[PDB]
Structures are given as structure tokens and as C-alpha cells.
Amino acid sequence: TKETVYISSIALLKMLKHGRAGVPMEVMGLMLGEFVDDYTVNVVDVFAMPQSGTGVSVEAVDDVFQAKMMDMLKQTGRDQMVVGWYHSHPGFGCWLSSVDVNTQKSFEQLNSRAVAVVVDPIQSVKGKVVIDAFRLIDTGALINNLEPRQTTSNTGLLNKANIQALIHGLNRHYYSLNIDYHKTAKETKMLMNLHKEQWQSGLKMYDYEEKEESNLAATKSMVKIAEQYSKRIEEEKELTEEELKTRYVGRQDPKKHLSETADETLENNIVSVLTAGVNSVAIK
């Protein structure tokens, strides 16, 4: 009647390398894991399908591609049971694809635990994974009327227009789910220490101070030349006797002539504090 979707970190990003930044003509693939229906959902092992000229087709659904993939499950040690399939579509407002559901229908009778999780490679640019799910009726009141999404209040699903209001009548062909992310201890602090912001920057002792010979005088020229202009412009703009407030130029005119000059003085003061003094760590 109601479920909840949880996806780990390793299974979160694989295809999205091809989906997000790997341009359109998206691929599909199989998800693996173990869970209990109607309560929780788990996805661990994921591997994609081959790409063809027509995209998703019968050859990708065929198990000949999976025949050699299932042999690699026991060899690499990573093996699970089929929890569903995943796809992508370029942000269709209504009825992404009816072909992916037909693949879900044929594989539903043999599993009934399969969950179809599709993500939009277009509108995911914001960094947040677009949540959409297609599933057959679990324990049916859906043949007439039922409300999916355990904790029916939850949060507004957003999206756009059509399929948001089509949940009631089309519930047989559309089963809504709220997708959530989770990570274990080895997926939390282990990856954070090697990522944080930008990169990990191994061997922190590497800096630009070893490159400083003529640029030391160039830094002294940047804290003077561009700074002398900020001193005259600050007095030139404030000298205006008009005021009158109201609107005029006040959206941001004065920033560059008044306030940003204070920030421009700080921009050269930040690089001055950047290396600061005695950055050779004591010694001589």
C-alpha cells in the first residue's frame, strides 16, 4: 500500500556520470540489493546497459548482455538480487516513456519487489536528484482509490503540472514514491576527508611561495597601483551634494565607487594575509 525509497551513496552516482555531465542519449541499467517490501527499499549494486542508436530497445532488455554481467558478480564478490531498473528522460512534463513501464511489467511478475527509479539528466543541474518512481500496485486498494507515499503528508512533490494531478486516476499505472539518500560510516567520514571542498590536496606543504621571485614585487604593485584609484574614486563619488535618497542609482551604483573599493582594499589584504608572514614554519 505504501513504501519508502532509500538509496546508498555508491549506488547513487554511476549513470549520472553519463546522465548529468555525459550529455543526452542516456543509458539504462540494473539495480541490485536486498530489502523488505512495503517498508524499506535498498539499492547497492548497479551496472548500466549498452548504448544503441535508438537508445533503450529490446537488445538492452535482453539478458545476453546480462549473461556476462551475472558471471562477473561472483568473481568480483559483489552480488545481490534484482531490486529494479533505472532510466533517464530529458525532463518530459508528462508521460516520460511508456516503453520503460512495459519492461517493468514483464519483470514484475517474476520479482514484484522491483522498483523503477528514473532521474532527469536535464533538470538535475541543481545537484539534487529528481525523484520519480514507477511501480505496480503493492497490496491493492489502487485498483480504485489509495494514497501512496507512506506518511501521506510528507512534503510537496513539486515537479510541474500534469502527472502531479494525475496521481489519483492513473494510480494503477503510476505509483508515487519519496526517494531518500543514506550512507554508512565508511561512506560518511571516509570520503569526506578525501573530498571536503575542491580536492583533498595531498601534501599540504605545496604552495605558491616556492614560486615567488619576481611576483613578490608584483604583489607589492597590486596592493598599490589598483589601490590608489580606489582612494580617489571613494572621495569623488561621496563629494556629490545631491543625495535626495528615494531611488535614483541606489540599486547598486555606489558599490564600485564607494563600498567595493573597501572590498577592493580587502581583496589585496586577503592575499596579503593568504601567505601572511613567516610561512616557512619558523626555522630560519
Partner 1 sequence: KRIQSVPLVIGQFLEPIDQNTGIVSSTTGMSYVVRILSTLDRELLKPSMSVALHRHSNALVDILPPDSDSSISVMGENEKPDVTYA
Partner 2 sequence: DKTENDIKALQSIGQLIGEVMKELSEEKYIVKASSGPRYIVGVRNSVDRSKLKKGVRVTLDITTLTIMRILPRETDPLVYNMTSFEQ
Partner 3 sequence: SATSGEAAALGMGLCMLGTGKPEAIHDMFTYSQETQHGNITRGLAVGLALINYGRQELADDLITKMLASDESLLRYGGAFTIALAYAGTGNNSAVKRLLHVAVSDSNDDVRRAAVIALGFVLLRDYTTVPRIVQLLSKSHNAHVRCGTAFALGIACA
DSSP 171: T
DSSP 111: T
Q: Is 50 in the site for partner 2 (CB under 8 A)?
A: no
The option from partner 2, partner 1, partner 3, none interacting with 278 (CB < 5 to 8 A, set by class) reads none
Pick from 5, 29, 31, 35 the residue near partner 3 by CB under 8 A: 35
Q: Is 248 left (phi over 0), alpha (psi -120 to 50) or beta?
A: left
β-pairing, 116-119 vs 133-134, is antiparallel
Pick from 17, 24, 39, 200 the residue near partner 3 by CB under 8 A: 39
List, as one string, the DSSP characters of 21-73: SS-SS---EEEEE---TTT------EEEPPP-TTSS-HHHHSHHHHHHHHHHH
List, as one string, the DSSP characters of 176-240: ---EEE---STTTHHHHHH-SSS---SSTT--SGGG-SSHHHHHHHHTTHHHHHHHHHHHHHHT-
133 bridge partner residues: 117
DSSP 143: T
Cα–Cα distance measured from residue 26 to residue 22, given in angstroms and rounded to the nearest whole number: 8
Q: Is 8 in the site for partner 3 (CB under 8 A)?
A: no
Q: Is 122 in the site for partner 1 (CB under 8 A)?
A: yes
Using DSSP's 3-state secondary structure scheme, residue 133 falls into strand
81 bridge partner residues: 33
Identity of the residue, 211 or 247, whose beta carbon is nearer to partner 1 in the bound complex:
247
Pick from 76, 98, 110, 127 the residue near partner 1 by CB under 8 A: 127
Edge-to-edge order in the sheet of strand 81-88? 46-48, 29-33, 81-88, 116-119, 133-134
Q: Is 93 in the site for partner 2 (CB under 8 A)?
A: no
The option from partner 3, partner 1, partner 2, none interacting with 54 (CB < 5 to 8 A, set by class) reads partner 2
Identity of the residue, 34 or 253, whose beta carbon is nearer to partner 3 in the bound complex:
34
Select from 37-45, 53-61, 120-128, 187-195 the region that touches partner 1 (CB under 8 A).
120-128
Select from 39-47, 57-65, 170-178, 244-252 the region that touches partner 3 (CB under 8 A).
39-47
By rule CB under 8 A, what string of x and - marks binding of each residue 215-244 to partner 1? ------------------------------
Q: Is 181 in the site for partner 3 (CB under 8 A)?
A: no
Report in angstroms how near the CB of residue 252 gets to partner 1 at its nearest.
Answer: 5
Identity of the residue, 183 or 256, whose beta carbon is nearer to partner 1 in the bound complex:
256
68: how many CB neighbours lie within 10 A of its CB? 9
Select from 39-47, 49-57, 226-234, 253-261 the region that touches partner 1 (CB under 8 A).
253-261
Q: Is 22 in the site for partner 2 (CB under 8 A)?
A: yes
Identity of the residue, 252 or 279, whose beta carbon is nearer to partner 1 in the bound complex:
252
Q: Is 24 in the site for partner 2 (CB under 8 A)?
A: yes
Give the footprint of partner 2 on this chain (CB under 8 A): 22-25, 54-55, 57, 90, 122
